[PDB]
Design a protein around this ligand. Structure first.
Ligand SMILES: Cc1cc2nc3c(=O)[nH]c(=O)nc-3n(C[C@H](O)[C@H](O)[C@H](O)COP(=O)(O)OP(=O)(O)OC[C@H]3O[C@@H](n4cnc5c(N)ncnc54)[C@H](O)[C@@H]3O)c2cc1C
Ligand SMILES: Cc1cc2nc3c(=O)[nH]c(=O)nc-3n(C[C@H](O)[C@H](O)[C@H](O)COP(=O)(O)OP(=O)(O)OC[C@H]3O[C@@H](n4cnc5c(N)ncnc54)[C@H](O)[C@@H]3O)c2cc1C
Ligand SMILES: Cc1ccc(OCC(=O)N2CC[NH+](C)CC2)cc1
Ligand SMILES: [Br-]
Ligand SMILES: [Br-]
Ligand SMILES: [Br-]
Ligand SMILES: [Br-]
Lengths: 489, 487
C-alpha cells in the first residue's frame, strides 16, 4: 500500500479547515486531503466532520436556545389575548434532542457527499499528526503508538484542530460533565449547576431553565463578581438581572472546591466558601483550550505560545515555513466566522497570488442568552485607555410590547462608543430581542469607518428596536483621559 | 388673539417634531392645533398623530399578537406539548391592551405640553384665514364657531393623510383601517381590498384572531400585490400568506357592495364573481388631508395628485407657509415626517439650511413573515444604470424545517451598480428583516460596495449573515434587459 501525495493536507475538517480545503481545490485546482476523527456527531469524540460548531457548538445550541425561547413565548402570549390550558404545558426534552440530532446528521451526510464527489478534495478518517515537515501520519487513535492507516505527503500543511473544554483539577471532577455531554443528556436535569461566567455557561443555563421538570432549579456560579467578562458592563449587569428574573439563580464570587455523590446518587457540591448545593448535573464551562497535544508538534518544532496555542504571524504562518494554523488552535478569537475568514485568506495568499490577512478588529458577535446580546468593537473602558476623549451614547428602556407581555424586566440596551475627537464609532453594544440580527450590518459600518453622524443622519425604520441606533445625537457621558464624567470640562 | 413664531396645524409625527424643536432648541413661541386629545372615534387620529393613534404603534402591537398563532404551532417541533383544542385568541383583550398603551402615549404628550416653555396646544380644527393668521374652529365646517385666532410669522401644514374610498355603490357599507382598530368582535369572514402594506398587514392580523370557521380574503385589482417592493419578495410573500390560510384574489376589484338580511355584506366584483363577508376593509390608498384647511384663502398651490406643492426645503409658493409629512404626498412614513420637520426648523430658525434626503430610506412591512428593504429595486436600477448585478439567496432556515413551517423561505437580495460594485438596494423577507435592515441604511450612506459586505465577518448563526456571504451575481440587467450572463 502506497502513501498518497497532496498540495495541501488539512488536519481537522472543521469551520476553518473545510473552508481552506474547499477553496484550494475548487478555486485554485489544488489536490487537498482533510483528516478528521469521526464522520458524524456525538460520542465518543463529539466533534466530527464539519467541526465543533456543526456538531456540538453554534448550530445545535442555537436550535436548543430557540426551543427554550418558547417558554417565554407561551407565557407572553396571554398579554395579547391568547388563552389555553396552562396546566397541560410540558417541555419534552427528548423530542428537542432527537430533532437536533437529525438536523446535525443531515449536515454530516452532506459534507460526506461533498468529499465523495469533489475532484481533488479527499477525506481521511483518523487521528492526524506531524511526522516530518512534509508528511502527515493518520493513526487509528490519538495514541502515537496506535496503528498507521495512511501517510499523507504534503507540500503545505494546515493545523485546524480547534479547541476542547477545560476541566478544573478538583476532587470529584469525574462526577461533572462539559457542554459535549450536555448535548446528549437522556433527560433534562431537575437541578443543574453551570460553572462559568462565559457565554457557554450562560446559554446553557437558559436552555436548562426552560426544559427543567416541574420541581426544578438552574444555578449558575462564577468565581468573580460579574459574569460575561469582556462584554459591555451595562449589558453584563442587565443580563444578570434578566436571568434572575426568569428564575435562574446566579452565585457570584463562588467556586466549587469538590464534588461528591450523595447516597441517592445526586451530586453534592462544596464551594470554597463552605456553601453547599445538591444538584443532578454539574456542567463545567470555565474555558476552552487549543487542541495541540495529539499533533506531535515536537517532531517538527512548531512553536507554541506561553498560553498554549500555536504561534502564528498575521498570515497564519508558524515558525516552520510551510506549516500554518488557523481557528481555535491559535487561541485568539474562538468564533466560527473568524476561522473561516482565516482559512479563505490563507488559501488566497498561498495558492492565489493575492495576499490577504484577517482583520481581527471590529468583529461582530453574539450571545444567545435569553434575551440575547449583539456586539461589535470596543467596550468603553478599553477605548478610554487608547483615546483621550471617548463619548458614550446610551438608550435603555423596556419596549412597549413587553409592557403588554408582562416581561417588564426585559430592558433593551443600545450603546454606541465613539472617539469624540472625530466622531468615529469604536463599538456598538446591544441587549434585547433581535440583537444578533441587528448587529451584523453594524460590522459593515465599522469596517467602513462610520461616524456617529452617519448613524444619526440615517432615517429610522419604525417601529423597531434597531432605530434607537439612529436616534442618538448627544452623549450620555464621556471619558476624558480615562476619567468618567457626565460633561466635558 | 395670540402671537406666535410658529403655528403648527396637526400634532402628528412631523408636527410635534417641528414644534418641540422650535421651542426647546431655538427658544421660539409655538402653538400646535389638533382635533382630539386622545385616540379613537370620532376623528381617530389625535394628539400624537396617525402613527401613534391609528397607525404604526397600535398595528405593530396587533401584528405581534397575531404572530403567537405561529409560535404556538411551531413550538411543537421543539418538544412543547399542550392541549391544542384549548387554544383561543381573545380579540377583545388585544384591543383593550392596545387602547391602554395608546392612551398612555396620549397622556404623555399632554404632560409634554404642560411642562415645556413656549409650546402651547389648541383643540379644534385649524385653517388658513390669511397669510399670517390661523383660525381654530369647533368643527371641520368653515362656518362653525371660532375658538382662537392665532397670528404667526410662520405656518406649518402637517395634517397628514386619510383613507381613500372608491366611488362604488355601497361604499358606505365598507370600513377603513381607522374602524378596524376598534371592531367590537374579530370578523369571522373579512375581505381586505388593496395590494399595499396596510391591506397585507391587517390580513395577517384578522387571520390569527378569526373565530372558528373563519376566512380572510385579500383582493387586489392587478396581477401581483405589494407594488414597489422587490418582485421576488412580492411573489414569496404571496406564497407564504397563502400557506397560512389567506386567500389572495388577484386581478379582482369590487364593483359594488350591498347589505344582507343577516347584517353581512354581499360583494360583487367587476368580473361578476360574488363573495359574502362580515367586514369589507378598503385599503386601496391614502390621500393628503387638505380639504379642511381652506387653502384657497391664501392660494397655496397643490400638485395634480392633491399634495401641497413644496420645494426641497418644504416651502410652499406662499412665503412663510410650509408643508411636511403625508400632506406633501411623497414618502408616507413617520420617520420621514420627523426628519422633514427637524430640517425645516433648522433652516428657518437656525443658521443652517437642511433638506431631507428621500433616497435610500429604509422601511418595512409587518406582514407575517415581514419585509425589510432599503434603496432601489432592480427594475428601477436597470433604468438608471447600464449594468446592474443582482445577488440572491433564498432558502428555508433550519429552524423552520424543525418547526414545520417549511414554506417560510428567507429571501435576501442585494442590487448593485455592477460597473463599480456600489450597493443600490437591499431587500429582505423573513423573521427579523425589519431589524436587520436598519444598519444597511447606514451602509448606503457610506457608499458601501458589495465587496464591503462580503469582506465583513459574519455573526453566526443568523439570517443576517447571508448579506455577507454573496460573492457572485445570480443575474444582471444590461441596458435594461434581464440576462443570466454578461455579454
Ligand atoms: C458550545 C459551543 C457553542 C459555540 N457557539 C458559537 C456561536 O454561536 N458562534 C460562533 O461563531 N462560534 C461558536 N462556537 C465556537 C466555534 O464552534 C469554533 O470557534 C469553531 O468551530 C472553530 O473552528 P476551527 O476550524 O478552529 O475548529 P473546529 O470547528 O473545532 O474543528 C476542528 C476539528 O478537528 C478535529 N480534530 C481534532 N484533532 C484532530 C486530529 N489529531 N486529527 C484529525 N482531526 C482532528 C475535531 O474533531 C474537529 O472536527 C461555539 C463553541 C462551543 C463549544
Ligand atoms: C394603518 C397604518 C399603519 C402605518 N404604519 C406605519 C409604520 O409601520 N411605519 C411608518 O413609518 N409609517 C406608518 N404609517 C404612516 C404614518 O402613520 C404616517 O406617515 C405619519 O403618521 C404621518 O405623519 P404627519 O406628520 O404627516 O401627520 P400625522 O401623524 O397624520 O398627524 C396629522 C394630525 O393632524 C390632525 N389634523 C388633521 N386635520 C386637522 C385640522 N384641520 N386641524 C387640526 N388638526 C388636524 C390629525 O388629527 C392628526 O393627529 C402607517 C399609517 C397607517 C394608516
Ligand atoms: C394548537 C394551535 C396552535 C395555533 C393556533 O392558532 C389559531 C389557529 O390555528 N387559527 C387558524 C384557524 N382559524 C379559524 C383560527 C386561528 C391554534 C391551535
Ligand atoms: Br423530557
Ligand atoms: Br450628529
Ligand atoms: Br385594489
Ligand atoms: Br402588478
Amino acid at each position: 500500500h502506497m502513501s498518497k501525495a497532496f498540495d495541501l493536507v488539512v488536519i481537522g475538517a472543521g469551520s476553518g479547515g473545510l473552508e481552506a480545503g474547499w477553496n484550494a481545490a475548487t478555486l485554485y485546482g489544488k489536490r487537498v486531503a482533510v483528516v478528521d476523527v469521526q464522520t458524524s456527531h456525538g460520542p465518543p469524540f463529539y466533534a466530527a466532520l464539519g467541526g465543533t460548531c456543526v456538531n456540538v457548538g453554534c448550530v445545535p445550541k442555537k436550535l436548543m436556545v430557540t426551543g427554550a425561547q418558547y417558554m417565554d413565548h407561551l407565557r407572553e402570549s396571554a398579554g395579547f389575548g391568547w388563552e389555553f390550558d396552562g396546566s397541560s404545558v410540558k417541555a419534552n426534552w427528548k423530542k428537542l434532542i432527537a430533532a437536533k440530532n437529525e438536523a446535525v446528521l443531515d449536515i454530516n451526510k452532506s459534507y460526506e457527499g461533498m468529499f465523495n464527489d469533489t475532484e481533488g478534495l479527499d477525506f481521511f478518517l483518523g487521528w492526524g499528526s506531524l511526522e516530518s515537515k512534509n508528511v502527515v501520519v493518520v493513526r487509528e487513535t490519538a495514541d502515537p503508538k496506535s496503528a498507521v492507516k495512511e501517510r499523507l505527503q504534503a507540500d503545505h500543511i494546515l493545523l485546524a484542530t480547534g479547541s476542547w473544554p477545560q476541566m478544573p483539577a478538583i476532587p470529584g471532577i469525574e462526577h461533572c460533565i462539559s457542554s459535549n455531554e450536555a448535548f446528549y443528556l437522556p433527560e433534562p436535569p431537575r437541578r443543574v449547576l453551570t460553572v462559568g461566567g462565559g457565554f457557554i455557561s450562560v446559554e446553557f443555563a437558559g436552555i436548562f431553565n426552560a426544559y427543567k421538570p416541574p420541581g426544578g432549579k438552574v444555578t449558575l456560579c462564577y468565581r468573580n463578581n460579574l459574569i460575561l467578562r469582556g462584554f459591555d458592563e451595562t449589558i453584563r449587569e442587565e443580563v444578570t438581572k434578566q436571568l434572575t428574573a426568569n428564575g435562574i439563580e446566579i452565585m457570584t464570587n463562588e467556586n466549587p472546591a469538590k464534588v461528591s455523590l450523595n447516597t441517592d446518587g445526586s451530586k453534592h457540591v462544596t464551594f470554597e466558601s463552605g456553601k453547599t448545593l445538591d444538584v443532578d448535573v454539574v456542567m463545567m464551562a470555565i474555558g476552552r483550550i487549543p487542541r495541540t497535544n495529539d499533533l506531535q508538534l515536537g517532531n517538527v518544532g512548531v512553536k507554541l505560545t506561553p498560553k498554549g496555542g500555536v504561534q502564528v504571524d498575521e498570515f497564519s504562518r508558524t515558525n516552520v515555513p510551510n506549516i500554518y494554523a488557523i481557528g481555535d488552535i491559535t487561541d485568539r478569537l474562538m468564533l466560527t466566522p473568524v476561522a473561516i475568514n482565516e482559512g479563505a485568506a490563507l488559501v488566497d495568499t498561498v495558492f492565489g497570488n493575492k495576499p490577504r490577512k484577517t482583520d481581527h478588529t471590529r468583529v461582530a458577535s453574539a450571545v444567545f442568552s435569553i434575551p440575547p446580546i449583539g456586539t461589535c468593537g470596543l467596550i468603553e473602558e478599553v477605548a478610554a485607555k487608547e483615546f483621550e476623549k471617548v463619548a458614550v451614547y446610551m438608550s435603555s428602556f423596556t419596549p412597549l410590547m413587553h409592557n403588554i407581555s408582562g416581561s417588564k424586566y426585559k430592558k433593551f440596551v443600545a450603546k454606541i462608543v465613539t472617539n469624540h475627537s472625530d466622531g468615529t464609532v469604536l463599538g456598538v453594544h446591544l441587549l434585547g430581542d433581535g440583537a444578533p440580527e441587528i448587529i451584523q450590518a453594524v460590522g459593515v459600518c465599522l469596517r467602513l469607518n462610520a461616524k456617529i453622524s452617519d448613524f444619526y443622519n440615517t432615517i429610522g425604520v419604525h417601529p423597531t428596536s434597531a432605530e434607537e441606533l439612529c436616534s442618538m445625537r448627544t452623549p450620555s457621558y464621556y471619558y476624558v483621559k480615562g476619567e468618567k464624567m457626565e460633561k466635558l470640562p
